[PDB]
From a paper:
The structures of two palindromic DNA-Atu1419 complexes solved at 2.79 Å resolution (P6422 space group) and 2.05 Å resolution (C2221 space group) present a distinct neighboring crystal packing with an asymmetric unit containing a monomer bound to a single DNA strand and a dimer bound to the 10-mer palindromic DNA, respectively. Nonetheless, a tetramer, where dimers AB and CD bind each to a DNA palindrome, was reconstituted by crystal symmetries in line with the conservation of Atu1419 tetramer in solution upon DNA binding. The three monomers of the asymmetric units (one in P6422 and two in C2221) are similar with an average RMSD value of 1 Å for all Cα atoms making almost identical interactions with DNA, although the positions of the DNA binding domains within the dimers between the two crystal structures do not completely overlap. Each monomer recognizes a half-site DNA with helices α2 and α3 of the HTH motif making nine polar interactions with both strands in the major groove of the DNA. All Atu1419-DNA subunits contain a bound Zn2+ ion at the same position as that observed in both Atu1419–citrate complexes. In contrast to the protein-DNA complex in C2221 space group, which crystallized in MES buffer, the P6422 protein–DNA complex reveals a bound citrate in the effector binding pocket. This citrate adopts the orientation B described in both Atu1419-citrate complexes, except for molecule A (orientation A) in the P212121 structure. Because both tetrameric Atu1419-DNA structures are similar, the presence of the bound citrate in orientation B in all subunits of one DNA complex has clearly no effect on Atu1419 for DNA binding and DNA release, in agreement with EMSA and promoter activity. Thus, Atu1419 is a tetramer in its apo form, upon DNA binding or effector binding suggesting that this quaternary structure is the biologically active form. Both crystal structures of Atu1419 in complex with DNA revealed that each dimer of Atu1419 within the tetramer can bind a palindromic site of 10 bp, separated by approximately 10 nm.
Here, we characterized Atu1419 as a transcriptional repressor of its own repression in addition to two other genes (atu1418 and atu1420). The structures revealed Atu1419 to be a member of the VanR group of the FadR C-terminal domain (FCD; Pfam PF07729) subfamily of the large GntR superfamily of transcriptional factors (>93 135 members in Pfam database). Like FadR, Atu1419 possesses a characteristic molecular architecture, composed of a conserved N-terminal DNA binding domain containing the wHTH motif and a C-terminal effector binding/oligomerization domain. We identified the short palindromic region composed of 10 base pairs and a degenerated palindrome bound to Atu1419 and the N5,N10-methylenetetrahydrofolate (MEF) as the effector molecule disrupting Atu1419-DNA interaction, allowing the expression of the second part of the HCA degradation pathway.
Author numbering:
A (entry chain A), B (entry chain A): 6 to 244
Amino acid sequence: AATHGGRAVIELREKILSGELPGGMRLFEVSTAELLDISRTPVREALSRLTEEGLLNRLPGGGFVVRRFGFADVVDAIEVRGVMEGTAARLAAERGVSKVALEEIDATVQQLDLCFGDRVDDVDFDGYAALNRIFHHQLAALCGSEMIRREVERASSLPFASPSAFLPDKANIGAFRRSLRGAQEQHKAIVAAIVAREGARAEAVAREHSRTARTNLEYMIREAPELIAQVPGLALISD
Amino acid sequence: AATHGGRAVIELREKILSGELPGGMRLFEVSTAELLDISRTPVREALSRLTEEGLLNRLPGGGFVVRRFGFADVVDAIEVRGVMEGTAARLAAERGVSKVALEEIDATVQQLDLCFGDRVDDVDFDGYAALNRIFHHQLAALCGSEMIRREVERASSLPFASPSAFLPDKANIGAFRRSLRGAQEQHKAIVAAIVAREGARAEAVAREHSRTARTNLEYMIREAPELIAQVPGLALISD
DNA sequence: ATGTATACAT
DNA sequence: ATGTATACAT
Ligand SMILES: [Zn+2]
Ligand SMILES: [Zn+2]
């Protein structure tokens, strides 16, 4: 936002994700106010917003501490997204989707197919990730329920939890621009099952889709330990 | 808490749940501060805590509005708890549970069996609900993951979402003190599947268990429209 | 209105 | 330390 509190959130978030403000660090109002050249008031607001964002934990006595995240927490958070995305898909199958909503998601699927040429590596890496995030948002709202959309989007809220999190500009190597051809099939399958009222298949595929990220992350560890810093908010991991 | 902000949260929550502060009502700092005889400062804190609690929504321009909840939102929220509790059970099966943790949950299951005599209506309604809430907390932490415990407990956070929500003192009628005999079997089944590393069964039963509440609520609508007010936070429903 | 700084109490 | 009231700007 155009406010000190708004800016404070953006700055503090950046510092937390960069590792600058490490996990387990207690953030004091007085000292954070000093760091941001603002008073305690917009700081309290920022700390309260970053708390609902899940980057900070409120302490028992009062006060805030930066949340600790291990590779364990990356694994589980991806699993929860999968479970949630699966629930979003299953409910769309069980309950039905309006023609309008189905047209929208089918259109995004078509646009995502346009990102593929003919070769194993000929793929618009930047154009895909932007559309992929559109798909996941549509799927979250697809069953019609707001409560579901809200909760599904929250499970895909953390930086490593995000759908297009394991799609940065630098991780453009052959081991990830080949996996995407298959992820597009999963996207097609999700919709195709929803249309077919195949709840089991819908949930199953939507879960297996999130497992693509866990798969990609496990390759970044074993094949590029320096590209670890590249993933949006993977630098903050204490492992 | 022993603070104005702490008290403010407790009061505001009470007013929201009672319907006194209806859903869709914008809460202004100045006017809430007047209502609570406190200044804007502990109010801002209360509004920020009730926001992370999910009883208030932040508005685009700034400000807070009381969240609207329909019977649709009760249905979906129960479903999400089920999905989450299922995930907590499935992961406990897939990953394994320490002897200590398994002893604890098995002990709670035993204590819950003590709440049953021999007749269809001979059941400690107050003693069950308190132990039932212990079970659900144990199950949430059973797979060992903190991230899972945290997210499972959140899906069981809303007043109607809670495990022992459809177990108040007045809803002591024969249509709910008979259902509990079967819910104890579901509790046994959950643990028995976890021990047996039967992931499918664990998730399946844990989901079907939450459906007991949706079943109970659907009977309260069709058979006791005045006992609607009795459920902890069901008064705030705009249907 | 909410944003903000700040003085005083703990 | 965080809690709190409050004056001033929007
Ligand atoms: Zn995707
Ligand atoms: Zn239960």
